[PDB]
Design a binder for this molecule. Structure first.
Ligand SMILES: Cc1cc2nc3c(=O)[nH]c(=O)nc-3n(C[C@H](O)[C@H](O)[C@H](O)COP(=O)(O)O)c2cc1C
Ligand SMILES: Cc1cc2nc3c(=O)[nH]c(=O)nc-3n(C[C@H](O)[C@H](O)[C@H](O)COP(=O)(O)O)c2cc1C
Ligand SMILES: Cc1cc2nc3c(=O)[nH]c(=O)nc-3n(C[C@H](O)[C@H](O)[C@H](O)COP(=O)(O)O)c2cc1C
Ligand SMILES: Cc1cc2nc3c(=O)[nH]c(=O)nc-3n(C[C@H](O)[C@H](O)[C@H](O)COP(=O)(O)O)c2cc1C
Ligand SMILES: Cc1cc2nc3c(=O)[nH]c(=O)nc-3n(C[C@H](O)[C@H](O)[C@H](O)COP(=O)(O)O)c2cc1C
Ligand SMILES: Cc1cc2nc3c(=O)[nH]c(=O)nc-3n(C[C@H](O)[C@H](O)[C@H](O)COP(=O)(O)O)c2cc1C
Ligand SMILES: Cc1cc2nc3c(=O)[nH]c(=O)nc-3n(C[C@H](O)[C@H](O)[C@H](O)COP(=O)(O)O)c2cc1C
Ligand SMILES: Cc1cc2nc3c(=O)[nH]c(=O)nc-3n(C[C@H](O)[C@H](O)[C@H](O)COP(=O)(O)O)c2cc1C
Ligand SMILES: Cc1cc2nc3c(=O)[nH]c(=O)nc-3n(C[C@H](O)[C@H](O)[C@H](O)COP(=O)(O)O)c2cc1C
Lengths: 189, 189, 189, 189, 189, 189, 189, 189, 189
């Protein structure tokens, strides 16, 4: 659609929080619109996928432009000299959000996110946990100060959703807008 | 069920964030289990109810034990000497979360929440906004330091939800647990 | 007495905290001593007056030099170019203290207090709440840093009070001293 | 009444702030309701008692379950291994509040309060001073962060008090509620 | 004894700090008193056990109600919806204390502790290191702000210990009291 | 041994925390190795010595090179112009740690420690308390920022201790190493 | 001279820092100019006077308008209701500066200074210590935020001093100017 | 040269940042001068060595006095009781710098560095990343507060370098000076 | 005396604060004891020398080992690779203290001091100003955190000084001790 003309490419990482379908649908949306997606899924994300979905273990690799596991710490986007247009961690665990906040860049996901931030590229973190305690909130404040977009994947009813897929589509569209993507979807305005 | 034997009573306030159904279902759940619910809905919550639901304007007053509008600043739970077992603001707007954080206690909802906090009673805030920027996060950190439970009403898939109502039931059950209620529902453990 | 020779004039505002009699008696004291008092009472202060006293709704307007309601946001002392010798908010609610602290200057009382502070004139806040939680205390610290006098209207027994009016007289005299007024009363020294 | 069935026991300490009668009446109230009270009065509290009351120097020892002077630094509740249900310092001087805040635990009162806090037992401080300056407020914020209840013994008029004893009864009842005591008294609700 | 009547269950985790015997004895104590103990031992804790004790590698699994290794990140208490009465990390390394403080929830121990904290359940950390430098102290302050009990397992002589086992019994009893357990042992009061 | 050749001299102070034997054994160790020890014991330390040991009240004075009581505020090491090689407070109460942190230098122990710090000499504080709450931790952070060594006297099992004296020897040796003393003892390396 | 016409009265306290002559000369200067001086000397100040001067122990009492010892905690200026024009602590120890900063108001000097500050009267602290470490500096910053004048009694040579008394006269004159006194002395302008 | 006479021994760790040659040359320099070097290389450092050099995988083990892999968490210098003269992490990744800062001491390198810091031994971190964002800078500030030397391995031209090896020699010499080594090299003075 | 055997060399800088004689006497003392002194005097220090002394404009250059003016920004000790044993700024103006604190290293004095600090060499700042306001105190706190010794050149009377030169000798001796110099002088101990 409107992402191949400028030839966009995004990093999308899935981590071990509930909501694997959100990252899968975001990858599907971005590639449909003509962007390249470099995808990574952590070991805990693969465990969560099995726990809460019926997706095949290879589906993310199949729909991505290029696929990396989390120990591929020499992947191209582990260096700031590799150009890309934004990274999303969807869904984002506390563990990965915190690893990014504090620089515990011990796998490809945290390192790629740190590289995204240091180069002042867009980073969107769909951080799923509730409640959030004071330590979580201090971590999210630090991430916001570092430039990350903090996007709790909250329930939203103002678009009159009728199915689970309706909720997923709204949240995925909203996350895509944080990457600079001008997605078409049902807005309040 | 297990809330009339100790004769629990809770304050539940609805504010002008998306997710009116979450507060309505929480009231329905708490009263079914035998607790008294003193309910309040802000003017913006009434506007949101009309925008995103088909509920009658009088439904919350009908299902509550006692109902107050937001300008009833002399309601019983506006004083710390009135005993109750916890307050939930569901859904909670940034405006009401921030008013509580900083003491702008200019209506019954913010005052009742401030009274809840100063008496070290339980306060649960189902704060719905995304993204959250650094000012939001500093406000939520302040609320957490004041003792509030910060509960973004996030999408949750580990209970294999099949309908919108499934998601609402999970989130409402989880919020109820933050009030000390031992609700029966589908848990990960 | 000793306030007309220099022709003092003070702003006294009553807000919706318990202790309306403290502000009424402060106005009575300041005018007896020959100062002009520009008075304002909030809507919640009028409600509290009815709840806890037998005072007529017009008494404050009757005893003041000039009277304003809280929506008179163009009153003379809403601008820093109007000269006066100090403002007291007695009693002061958390809502009004916090509105001043954080600049939510949405009525005449909060704006007049902000104007008092920015011009480095004396502002005394008789803040009545107990307990005070950590958010309250951070707000009061901010007000103190901005230059306000923080005067919780505490019980005081060292003057051997024999009636409620004895306690009111001590506290009102002490608040008056924070305005620079050399009131005559029973001191420890 | 409702404190012997669970066999409650509280520590009540009186310090050298005005309002000795508040601590005396709190001890009287707690023992009437069937709790044990372990009482301590500082040397400055004994001086204040003589200055502002006609109480005998031995009255607190007479009404307490067990009495300690402030240099009894080996009293049972100086160790966290001694069980009790809460401590109140009523009235609480700036000196004792600050000693607790900063760990200057140089007498039984400050040590017992520090032990109360480190064991996450309830501590209520009826801190009497006005004005409070920025150093006081930073100290009270620290105490609140450590878990203490900060209860300035403010004038309260919403129960229509007709005598000094009416004010004392309200404030003492409210302080008792901060210890978890379900006292019977005239409430706003 | 007094923990089966309410059917208590606790999480006890052992990490790679010196003092493995403290966690083993805590498990033994809690189960003797009739509580269920869900135990976890990290890989470094197993190494320390071999270095400083003669315990069999399977003893903790034998005495626990249910046993998990640290990579069992889908254990029941990894979700806040699983009910339990408190978690203790005994002994607690700097690595695990810090992982909890900052949200590096990369194994079952840190995740279970984070879940304990976000649900405002009791968490006791028997943090063993000396000296503690300024970074350690900032971490422990953050944990305390998040609600954890910070229990350095210090030498204690006021119970006149005559053997190493006497010291272990005192410290284990004191840690148990931080879980709300009313253990019987030799107290100063 | 290796402390008389450079003619070392240390200040060792005992305060009213449990673990008097730790300070006694540290004095014995330092003098055996040929250093001079200027010792001080607070009044609360003398009370603790009687409570938890069978030591004579004069033993510390007997084993020290020179002995001072805590009110000897003009002792030589109360001035920075007196040269010495380090001070240890063993055991160190919260009261004395906090007095040093905040400058409440009201006896010889706190003043000597403040003089040690301002001259950038070594100060080691064997701070014994558990739990430590957030106020304690903020105090210890301040002390660490001022340059003090923070040494909670924790249980240590990696040297396979078989008696209480084994634990004391390890902890005393470790504290001695913080003074720059190259003590001979059983190390992990 | 120019202090009796408005009938000034000051509190001057001497504490146990070197420079007793500075406080003695300040008292002499203020009374010569016609002000009343209420003087207090701590026990450590009396010890320092004997150590570094030949002054009689009764001289300060002789030259003061009224004299108090430090345990006269009921002196008139221990209450904010007693009027005076400023307090100076000259010389000021770290112990007394810190006691004021943190509210350890355990003698007349610290309490009178706290009362001076809470009433927004002038307080000048001639704080003598060198070096000042980071804890000292944080304390002095807190005092400055509370409104105190921080006056290290530094050597000054721009008035070409020829004797010790010349230095004392300059420093005492400069301290007097911080009390609002328009002393006549040799200025740079 | 001048490091065997006092028999120095250093820990040198290589982590997965660019600049493996800097750590290799530092080891070569320290051993040439007669010090013992205990070396450790992380898994990511071994990957970087292969990516950017032609060094054999066994070279670091060959030139070191003793060699450890990063999972040897029981190596001698993992305990503070093992004596050494300083540790350098050269080059130092953000991941390892941050792990040290925040106490995520999950391998030998981070633990050895934490042990170095808690014993107030010298730690030099040759932290290589650019840009550094605000989270990195807050981490480096924390490390500096903990006592670490923060040494970005910057280009330096004032010694007129003519080859890459000239730059390496300057930077390695400068890092060696931070360990207290008096290396001979071309200085500006 | 005891500074040539190890061949000490110090940087001594004079800035435009009163007390030029303190720096002159420090240079004289250090060279008498056999150290080399590299001296620098700012333009404002030369102006102050003329204003308050009769010293020739060339005296500092005459007594120094090597002399530099403040614009000699390429002097040897402007680089960290030049070895020296400590720097003193005596007397130190607010301008130069603040320039060092905040890195405004725009002349040789501020740069040499910054180089001293970054190499963790000793820096002593004889900061002369009174009063010190909150901005000064925040600056001095920052300098202390950076490792500088903060030495206000305060009047000291405990050595019974009889002349101005007696005071200078005490203060200069004390400053010399902060450089690690074991000067012989009249001490309290
Ligand atoms: C079924 C399941 C669901 C989980 N959901 C969350 C979650 O929603 N949020 C979270 O912070 N952690 C969650 N966790 C725990 C994380 O998976 C765990 O912290 C893991 O170490 C994260 O690692 P990663 O960020 O590298 O994928 C979940 C674990 C499981 C087994
Ligand atoms: C349809 C609709 C949906 C809204 N949803 C949110 C929301 O989800 N979160 C939020 O902070 N504000 C939301 N707002 C804006 C708030 O209603 C607005 O800030 C209002 O002043 C809140 O007032 P209240 O907290 O007193 O109800 C919404 C407004 C409308 C009209
Ligand atoms: C009878 C009554 C007494 C009240 N007392 C207090 C009080 O003492 N302190 C307080 O913060 N709020 C008190 N409130 C709540 C305030 O009136 C409420 O926050 C209001 O919005 C304050 O608005 P105002 O500051 O503009 O007058 C009271 C309310 C009522 C009805
Ligand atoms: C008559 C009298 C009343 C006092 N009232 C107060 C007070 O209300 N608040 C306060 O902080 N100090 C007050 N003080 C001063 C304290 O008694 C003084 O700070 C004392 O050291 C407190 O010690 P304590 O806390 O150990 O009892 C009063 C003193 C006197 C003589
Ligand atoms: C014998 C031995 C004893 C140890 N003792 C401690 C200790 O007391 N405190 C600490 O923080 N680390 C200690 N460590 C290091 C930790 O085991 C190391 O940081 C490890 O990564 C902790 O991981 P864990 O918390 O997941 O068990 C010790 C290591 C060994 C081999
Ligand atoms: C038997 C006994 C043991 C004590 N143990 C401790 C302790 O371990 N830690 C502590 O902070 N205070 C302890 N205290 C309380 C202190 O002794 C008390 O705070 C005292 O004022 C400390 O004063 P000092 O530091 O001047 O010796 C103990 C008191 C007693 C009677
Ligand atoms: C001769 C002598 C001189 C002293 N000089 C100082 C000093 O200059 N600054 C300081 O902080 N303490 C000094 N002290 C220590 C204080 O006197 C000690 O901290 C005392 O407790 C202060 O108590 P005060 O403030 O109540 O007088 C000195 C002590 C002595 C014996
Ligand atoms: C070729 C290569 C070069 C790297 N360079 C750096 C670097 O210069 N700085 C950095 O922080 N991370 C760098 N990384 C990423 C780290 O290796 C990664 O964060 C790793 O987890 C660090 O682990 P370690 O500190 O345990 O060695 C690099 C990775 C690769 C593959
Ligand atoms: C006679 C005289 C004395 C001065 N004394 C001081 C002083 O004691 N403290 C201070 O901060 N500034 C003092 N100043 C002002 C400084 O000289 C001025 O801030 C100057 O810019 C400092 O520059 P420098 O640090 O590079 O020498 C004095 C100025 C003059 C003319």
């Amino acid at each position: 659609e409107n992402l191949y003309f400028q030839g966009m490419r995004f990093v999308v990482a899935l981590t071990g929080a509930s909501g694997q379908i959100l990252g899968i649908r975001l990858i599907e949306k971005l590639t449909e619109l003509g962007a390249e997606v470099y995808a990574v899924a952590s070991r805990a994300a693969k465990i969560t996928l099995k726990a809460e979905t019926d997706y095949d273990e290879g589906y993310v690799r199949e729909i991505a432009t290029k696929y990396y596991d989390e120990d591929e710490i020499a992947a191209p986007f582990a260096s700031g000299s590799f150009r890309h247009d934004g990274m999303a961690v969807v869904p984002c665990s506390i563990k990965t959000a915190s690893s990014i906040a504090y620089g515990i860049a011990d796998n490809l996901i945290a390192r790629a996110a740190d590289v995204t931030l240091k180069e002042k590229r867009r980073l969107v973190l769909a951080i799923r946990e509730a409640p959030l305690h004071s330590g979580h909130l201090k971590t999210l404040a630090r991430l916001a100060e570092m430039g990350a977009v903090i996007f709790p994947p909250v329930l939203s009813f103002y678009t009159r959703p009728k199915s689970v897929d309706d909720l997923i589509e709204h949240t995925v569209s909203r996350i895509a807008e944080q990457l600079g993507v001008e997605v078409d979807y049902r807005r309040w305005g």
